[PDB]
Specification:
The complex is a heterodimer. Helices cover 0% and strands 0% of the residues of chain A. Chain A is low in regular secondary structure. Chain B has one domain (1-29). The chains are: A little secondary structure, B mainly beta. The structure holds zinc ion. Chain B: It is found in: Cell membrane; Cytoplasm, Cytosol.
Amino acid sequence: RNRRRVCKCPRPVVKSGDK
Amino acid sequence: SHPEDDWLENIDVCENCHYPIVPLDGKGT
Ligand SMILES: [Zn+2]
C-alpha cells in the first residue's frame, strides 16, 4: 500500500567535490 | 573505534530530507 517514508533524493550526497 | 551500529543495522538518517537512508538489502535469505 505505502512504502516506508525513507530518503527520496534525486542525487544523494557522495564523498567528492567539484573543483 | 567501537562498532558503528546504532540504527536498525548501522543505518544513517539523510538530513537532506530527514528520511532514513538505508542500503540495498538483497542478502540474508
Ligand atoms: Zn535524502
